[PDB]
Structure 1
């Protein structure tokens, strides 16, 4: 009578929701959506709305913003502003509440989105894969828990997202991930964030601003330079500026074991013998695709070398009617990229207008203090797949920071082109504005903009973004992998 579902979706995250909406309202298809909670917070943290809405994008931005105010208050003095210095109090409990209320606002809107949209229904519980055309809902992630629904399905979309990767050292239970940090009752006086990823950096600034008096935020990384994957010079600069803002950046170090002290504080011993005491140890060493609770072996879905789900240029798997998008693919773990993959999966199946999502020249940010904006390739990657590479550099200390009292906040801007046709292959910004600036840059790369298009454009003065139009000559080259300043006069 009620049949199956033209589509069932496991995980109502960024990608999950964009696929079920574009199907119930765009194609009148029957759609079901299974997620393990309706509201943010423990025990599962991620809930209806995805990691982005509950324990990612939205709440992180709000908290970084609040953390920027530490710098604002300090810098206002250069501009003549005075107020009781010792009376300032960073109320963490007040910040988390404001955040929680914002997140729950989104939790409810989606909560109502389902209650007035026929063909779109929400099922609370854990979704495991039974047959190649049946999804199993259970009260818990345990494959042997009570069943509450069995959703007959024509198409099945896997959008369970990703999960924080934890190492195998003794005492790892005394550690937290990005998940639990959003819900600390009090701001930790001493915090150690492990790893060099954008998550460890972004939370280091947040903890650094809301820490009570006498606090030290220590960030450790097992290799030499943090923020592996981002442009080189931006890496070393951000390291310098994090140090300036009081954060101890402790490189070439890896925790080896953690214990509890007589007062509940964590005692951390490293692989190099050095010990450090902290109130909170946060693991941000990577995110793995979330596939264990899915029982993907019951149908024989294939996984890549990394624990991720394998797919093609259309998000299809080996099983004929099973698709996967979002962070479960182990590709570009970004929210707009999962919304693009999800919107693209639908109108290629339920709309016979096949259009796949492009995974290259994608804009991303890193709301650190200072923030980062990137798009396209970095110079050392362009080298390994391009004849002649040109690099445009420029690192002025911004206009206002001679007065502000923050001389260290050097703004950086790099452009990477194929020197053959001057086409821009990358754009890498460090400094306030980088995130908002790069967005419009992503449209340029989608338009195959050559460097001439940039410096021939009239600037908006006075801005930092105008520095992208002020670079007319390369600072060095990358020809057949080698890096030399002057470009040797020896053609062909």
Structure 2
């Protein structure tokens, strides 16, 4: 060797740590991993473990699980479970305490991971580039901060992920994002969620569960229908189900300005001219790659749309020895995707066995209440790219909801196929257990499954998933881009 490190990883995230660990253990390389802090929390939020562990998937799901009990406690009544329901609210503070305990516990398991792994070291601070071989770790994000260390490396991996966009509106700084929501002292009584992304929807569901008495949550979106890019029938059925669960969904609406009332709350002026008071206002309107403070110009790494680091199918940047993975590349912003990209990177460069990450037919979930499980193409997209498209659809209400009272809780399955050969192009599910079911669906679609593979499989009874195997007749069709009730040419 002529260099201090083989790899310097900028960001100890989902992708960062995965790569760093692999190079260190499986290929015995000298890896240095740079992240902002060691444990979760403000004012930096993200930490060792990345967004997912600290202010993402992990804490968000624990809170969804918590909020889910609201429905579950109500539903037990029909089964004979008698208890004082009127004026029953959960303790937000014990939830946040429970959550912090867990997240911090994961943070600490990482410290002793670094301590035990040889060749792997953690370097706390803000990283930035000097040249293709030099990463400077500064005291703060400010480019004139004290240089804490200078890392002389062979390879540089950028895995700094993304960051919430703001509204750019008079009184914008009075709002919170997903970051601050995780650390709220008290559960808001009058909550407003701006946005129509999965984050906006999942959080609306959390606050809806943890609101105090007389509390309510409004979901405000500037478009026609929430969750763009999802199955249209799924989006409409969820909007309907959020309504039934107490979330007031507002459409074609946008905050114009926010002014802070002298009692603490926030006065919000709207698109249509209306005015309302909210105890808290959360912005979930977009997440841009975190690359602006990396001095990428100095090393000459090309950043396209919104600062996204431009990469080929092997994550290589404009500079031959610099790489980038995960949310910073602005592809599919999911944890297991970043993990996969990081795994491929190591296999390619240090394993000598190149591999590109497969970005198509990736299954994902929305942890709304009820949850979404999706994998593949929406009918609208499939119809543009294929000659003949068959749409299968089935809605049903599980029998338990006759007893539970939650008659609004329809399970929905929609299968999208290429009619030519029967190949399944998309699977879209709404209802409980949807995230769990879709995972094994994604294995099938990876194997290039056909609709005949589904209905030939003997079902498991009684389950919600068994309805995948009972869809033979298509609901309708798409003949070269247009919706037809019947098929003939």
TM-score (norm 1): 0.98
Contact 2:126 2:139 in 1 (8 A): yes
Question: For the structure 1 residues 97 and 5, does the alpha-carbon distance in structure 2 shift closer, same or farther, using more than 3 Å as the test?
Answer: same
How far the C-alpha of 1:87 sits from its partner, in A, is 6.2
How far the C-alpha of 1:2 sits from its partner, in A, is 8.3
What are the residue-to-residue correspondences of 1:466-477 with 2, within 5 Å? 466-477=466-477
Contact 2:89 2:213 in 1 (8 A): no
What are the residue-to-residue correspondences of 1:390-405 with 2, within 5 Å? 390-405=390-405
Q: Identify the residue that residue 20 of structure 1 maps to in structure 2.
A: 20
What whole-Å deviation, never above 9, does each CA across 1:372-426 have from its counterpart, x for those lacking one? 0000111010011100000100011122111111111111000000000000000
Tell which deviates more after alignment, 263-272 or 30-39: 263-272
Unaligned 5+ segments in structure 2 are none
How far the C-alpha of 1:194 sits from its partner, in A, is 0.5
Unaligned 5+ segments in structure 1 are none
What whole-Å deviation, never above 9, does each CA across 1:146-199 have from its counterpart, x for those lacking one? 111010110000000000011210111101110000000000011101000000
- Cα distance in 1 between the residues matched to 2:130 and 2:475: 58
What whole-Å deviation, never above 9, does each CA across 1:89-124 have from its counterpart, x for those lacking one? 300000000000000010000111111111100000
What whole-Å deviation, never above 9, does each CA across 1:266-314 have from its counterpart, x for those lacking one? 1111122111210110000011100111011111211123431110100
- Cα distance in 2 between the residues matched to 1:484 and 1:42: 54
Q: Identify the residue that residue 480 of structure 2 maps to in structure 1.
A: 480
How far the C-alpha of 1:78 sits from its partner, in A, is 0.8
Q: Identify the residue that residue 196 of structure 1 maps to in structure 2.
A: 196
Q: Identify the residue that residue 10 of structure 1 maps to in structure 2.
A: 10
Q: Identify the residue that residue 232 of structure 1 maps to in structure 2.
A: 232
**Does 2:276 align with 1:276?**
yes
How far the C-alpha of 1:132 sits from its partner, in A, is 1.7
Q: Identify the residue that residue 212 of structure 1 maps to in structure 2.
A: 212
Q: Identify the residue that residue 340 of structure 1 maps to in structure 2.
A: 340
**Does 2:98 align with 1:98?**
yes
* SS in structure 2 of the partner of residue 426 of structure 1: strand
- Cα distance in 1 between the residues matched to 2:384 and 2:306: 23
Tell which deviates more after alignment, 136-145 or 304-313: 304-313
* SS in structure 2 of the partner of residue 90 of structure 1: coil
What are the residue-to-residue correspondences of 1:238-249 with 2, within 5 Å? 238-249=238-249
Q: Identify the residue that residue 162 of structure 2 maps to in structure 1.
A: 162
* SS in structure 2 of the partner of residue 381 of structure 1: helix
* SS in structure 2 of the partner of residue 58 of structure 1: helix
- Cα distance in 1 between the residues matched to 2:331 and 2:361: 14
- Cα distance in 1 between the residues matched to 2:326 and 2:89: 39
**Does 2:288 align with 1:285?**
no
* SS in structure 2 of the partner of residue 277 of structure 1: strand
- Cα distance in 1 between the residues matched to 2:417 and 2:447: 14
* SS in structure 1 of the partner of residue 305 of structure 2: coil
Q: Give the ranges of 4+ consecutive aligned residues of structure 1 lying more than 4 Å apart after TM superposition.
A: none
Q: How many residues align?
A: 489
Q: Identify the residue that residue 416 of structure 2 maps to in structure 1.
A: 416
* SS in structure 2 of the partner of residue 263 of structure 1: coil
- Cα distance in 1 between the residues matched to 2:59 and 2:37: 17
- Cα distance in 1 between the residues matched to 2:117 and 2:409: 49
- Cα distance in 2 between the residues matched to 1:85 and 1:52: 34
- Cα distance in 1 between the residues matched to 2:2 and 2:125: 21
Q: Identify the residue that residue 311 of structure 1 maps to in structure 2.
A: 311
* SS in structure 2 of the partner of residue 153 of structure 1: strand
What whole-Å deviation, never above 9, does each CA across 1:453-473 have from its counterpart, x for those lacking one? 000100001011011000001
* SS in structure 1 of the partner of residue 428 of structure 2: strand
**Does 2:50 align with 1:50?**
yes
- Cα distance in 2 between the residues matched to 1:221 and 1:89: 27
What whole-Å deviation, never above 9, does each CA across 1:234-272 have from its counterpart, x for those lacking one? 000000000000001000001111010021101111122
Question: For the structure 1 residues 348 and 321, does the alpha-carbon distance in structure 2 shift closer, same or farther, using more than 3 Å as the test?
Answer: same
* SS in structure 2 of the partner of residue 483 of structure 1: strand
Q: Identify the residue that residue 172 of structure 1 maps to in structure 2.
A: 172
- Cα distance in 1 between the residues matched to 2:271 and 2:435: 36
